[PDB]
Design a protein around this ligand. Structure first.
Ligand code: MG
Ligand code: MG
Lengths: 106, 288, 288, 105, 287, 286
DNA sequence: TCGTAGCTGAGGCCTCAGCTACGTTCCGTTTTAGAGTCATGTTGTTTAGAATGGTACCAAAACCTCGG
DNA sequence: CCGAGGTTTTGGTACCATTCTAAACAACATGACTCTAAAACCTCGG
DNA sequence: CCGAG
DNA sequence: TCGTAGCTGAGGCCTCAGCTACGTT
């Protein structure tokens, strides 16, 4: 409908004790914001409208860990749905769907 | 805001972790971000859940519904403190004048009757539809003449036949009742969010039940449920139930925009409250 | 319907078996027949509970209360088909007369000032103690002269020196605040149990304070905290914290008997409410 | 107008055959002119949709049949909106859509 | 392939994994070979490997060499532009003198028309019509030298009657440079069809080895003329950079906006088919 | 202009200094004055070279030749402003008369047949050797009778048995083919050096080196010898034994010469005869 | 001072199970500025996907030339 | 005059790289609401 | 005035 | 039978320098 996906990818350093801590904090942030792990170091977040997207971008700058390479890509649900699984199983978690109605059980 | 209706009917453990609802069944496991959830509906009696989860559900303003051994709803969580400054609105609500309540209540019921008529028109009962509009024109403050009740009896007989009363035990009433409870819960939630007490209705104010004010506000919306069950009149109750969830999926025209029902209910409620508070004139209008 | 108020504040699992509420903690178990229960109060966020239990609790119209991470109440279950008798209290509370509120409030604050004085006496400040009693004798309804405030300022300066204000980021204030919040929560919880809204104070009428009425009721008890913090005024905050839990462990004289604090607060609150409701005369008295 | 093909993988490493399978696939990616954006994450510029269908075909032919491997097609315009929350933008020629290039200047 | 890679820094070029590898002391770039259309080596401070050159020749990449003043001086000439190369040779040797005349003259006509169109473009309505007249009087192999008269007029009109086209100046330098770029494009395309470039339509083997390319590029000369004219007051180094627009821009050809190298491919293939008497109409390019 | 043909086939770095070509290998170093050089031939893919060098090579109009990973030529530098004299050869080659091509081709094939016979003799087949000489005597221009082909079939059957054809997939043919390719490349390279195109041959299949195949014909038995002597061996051994072609010396024009040197002289002269600048095809025999 | 293909071991990225330690810090009230929310509509631009036109290449129809 | 066979022009399918075009979209516009902190006000005994 | 309510 | 915050060490992903062997020399 109006939904979009925010795709976030990172490579973050681990040499130092502080940059490990910096990572753990950032990942925690991502999980708490409702990002879901697509692959290691690569996370996606479903968003309802652009209004919500601008807001999340804002929150991301606020919790910038200021280390490594961290990169964001916006795309429509429609575009994301065209993702091609060359191999491996599709992600059928509820969190990864657009569905307004969900049944757990049934 | 939040937009998912989560229905739980499997033996399971609900818990909270990292801003997610955590669903664990023996086979399967799901995490759902709390900000995504609009409604949590607990259909069965085989579910465990934690008080942390409940707290967090109440924080986010999530409608939580409890059910029977027959999967009918039986109660709601009622937050005590729906907003940062709830004391302020409460004082205003206590000061609502009896005249202003009458104006607003009667305005609202008029909208219900109009929507009942529009629904009749929709089903090619051009005639009885006009009849209801007539009953509406005869309405006086607090409807001392059941015009509301006269209108409703007519409305229902014309839809489901003159053999039908709204007190008789059948699939149609069960469906109507269920749908009406969903609506009740939506407006109960919205009222508490604006800082009002739901116990204090405009006409009867707490005499009978604890959600009178919600019942008052939901009135114009009843036909939405009526439509859905009319269209599935011949179906089984379990199907009626599932079709009723369309209320949360669909969009409806309200104030020139097509909006989701929970969002309409928010705006509608806020404005009704503003008018009761005498901060503005003119009750908002919802028509089907 | 029943008579027991069941308070749960231990990490535990609640479930239903054989018309009993089943309480399981790691330490021990309890079974409690449902017909014996009037109120179920869930103080903490470390509790699991089943939907079966909730259904059955709603059947019986047992008042179920939820609390947050600070043990303040945040909501209750709202049945769609009946009412715990606590629902009747709201009407009564709305009817509290301005005079009766004044009487009760002023009575209460008098008790606070007395207890502040007694505490000063206790610390061999014979002289400033008498000074407070003087301020008390001059008290009029709703304290327009602010005798309370002048008493307090004096009280605190005497105890912690003239250089001391309640707003400076001390270990002492931190300790006081913490202790006061414990007390607040005790009385917030007791008030909602009786069916009152805590948002509606007698004199506390702050738009942001969701617990004005609780703040009013806890007033005479503040010195209990003051005593403890004073005795540990030279200690670190973590120790102050730990020493404050004595409030729950110790016993205090109340109506000729040595009672635990939570029990006192229950009796105290119930009676204050009865006298506001004009069902009895004579505010209950608590002195240190 | 140009497209980008974004390819992401997580591939197993436990066994010797898994590892070999990986090395082969990565080699193919490099040889096809994919660029490492991040570890396990590669992008390829393509001209037309003809080229894209053709690459997709070559990818199925060299599918290593292990792990999770996903592809995303997007317009150059979409890719150019990529936000670097931190770290420096990639100014390698291979990553640009410029017809005229200068190694120097 | 679609990129023009320009190298003018002290560097080492090499080949690895289907990439051109550029290594300078500062930084390092890899460029996929299939992406490259033209490799231009501007300076004399560059090392390169024979492996790289082989692979450049495999992919059909135009490689240009420059002197100390960054002017081009030569190109790589592949020997075997196809696997089927023998077939075209035999055909090319059989090109009849009359058909060569027809094709050559057709082509020169297109050049003159484009010279005219360019004059028209600069509001010389009058001299433009004059060229069209010279065109109408063309006969096979242009014995009258209408081409040369048309050109002298064209250039005097554009750059004044003081201007020769043999004088040492920025304008001619620019023209010459641009013309060489074009030459190289068509030299490549010819070899790719299996033709020898030494064998021109009017003069075969006469004073140079790319006569046939010069013949084919004729209609395209005004493209360079336009650019230089528009920058006639600029310095040579700017003229040079502006000329790379030829590879960036698109031009109308057979009803479509196409890139110049692609046009040159289609144009060349069809000219060759007509010379082979496999088809009739010479293809037309107009500016 | 100059007179030297500089051949580079070792991993090396070419550069320019003080009007010299500078050759640096890990072993050897050489400076060569640019005015001395006629042709620069880059046989292998393991060579670095600078653009300065290239500029200066182009200034002098030195013919620069490039080769692939097999050492076949694949291109040359084309100057925009002049011409190596090699450019004149193309015109001459186009003018080769059909008669002259016939004479030269037939002369050449005769040499091949002779050498096939000499090889048979070498293996104590005195009789079949004479038979080939007979086929040779019956040769006419462009061999319409296919005496070449009959000779070859006989030759090969005698060497490898009557069950053997040259089209069968086996180690012997693989070895032959490989060896023949080496030879092909040597002559391909020499032809392009003289300014000829290798694509169209003297007789007759679209191969890009027909003319090279024609020239190499008399040399084929050199390979045949080696493969015959290792006919029982594995292909990888056959391959390594074949490199003897580059290491050994052979009698040619009264002296023991290396094969590549022979091929140069041989080719240059064959071309001169085709151009009708000389009479008498050069002769190579085992 | 060339390439390819393949494997190995060193060392950096990334997640996760598992451990320890911690767990109520206001209450005179109302005003105001500011940062953080939000779901809808409006507008020209971009895009995916199929049409086009100019090809090749190959069965068809139509065209032809005798023989009954 | 028929059609057998064969020789020719014709029109068909199958292919690309552009171009077109209905549909999807980004980015801004709108018109609000929520919570927080700090700062403003209250009385009046040191 | 401060600063307690 | 509840949560958080913080760190660690085990173990799997991912790349790369460095090694061997080969190549119509
Ligand atoms: Mg990564
Ligand atoms: Mg990965």
């Amino acid at each position: 409908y109006r939904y979009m996906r925010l795709l976030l990818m990172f490579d973050m350093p681990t040499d130092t004790a502080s940059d490990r801590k910096a990572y753990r904090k950032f990942r925690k942030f991502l999980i708490n914001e409702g990002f879901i792990m697509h692959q290691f170091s690569v996370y996606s977040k479903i968003l309802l409208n652009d209004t919500a997207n601008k807001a999340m971008l804002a929150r991301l700058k606020q919790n910038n860990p200021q280390r490594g390479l961290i990169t964001l890509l916006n795309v429509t649900e429609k575009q994301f749905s065209r993702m091609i699984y060359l191999h491996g199983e599709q992600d059928n978690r509820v969190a990864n769907s657009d569905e307004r109605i969900v049944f757990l059980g049934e | 805001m939040g937009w998912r209706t989560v229905v739980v009917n499997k033996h399971s453990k609900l818990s909270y972790k990292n801003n997610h609802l955590v669903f664990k069944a023996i086979d399967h496991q799901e995490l759902i971000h709390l900000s995504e959830i609009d409604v949590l509906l607990l259909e069965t009696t085989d579910i465990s859940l934690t008080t942390m989860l409940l707290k967090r559900l109440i924080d986010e303003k999530i409608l939580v519904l409890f059910c029977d051994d027959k999967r009918l709803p039986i109660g709601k969580i009622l937050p005590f403190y729906g907003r940062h400054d709830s004391s302020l609105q409460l004082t205003r609500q206590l000061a609502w004048t009896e005249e202003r309540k009458g104006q607003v209540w009667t305005a609202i019921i008029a909208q219900k009757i109009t929507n009942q008529s529009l629904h009749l028109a929709q089903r090619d009962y051009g005639q009885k539809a006009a009849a209801l509009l007539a009953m509406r024109a005869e309405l006086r403050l607090f409807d001392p003449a059941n015009r509301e009740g006269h209108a409703a009896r007519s409305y229902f007989n014309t839809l489901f036949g003159n053999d039908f009363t709204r007190e008789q035990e059948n699939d149609i009433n069960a469906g109507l009742n269920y749908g009406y409870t969903l609506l009740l819960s939506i407006f109960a939630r919205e009222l508490v969010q604006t800082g009002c007490f739901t116990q204090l209705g405009l006409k009867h104010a707490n005499q009978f039940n604890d959600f009178n004010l919600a019942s008052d506000l939901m009135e114009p919306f009843r036909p939405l449920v009526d439509q859905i069950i009319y269209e599935n009149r011949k179906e089984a109750f379990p199907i009626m139930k599932r079709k009723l969830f369309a209320l949360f999926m669909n969009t409806y025209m309200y104030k020139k925009k097509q909006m989701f029902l929970t969002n309409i209910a928010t705006d509608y409620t806020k404005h009704v409250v503003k008018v009761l508070n005498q901060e503005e004139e003119g009750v908002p209008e919802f028509g089907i």
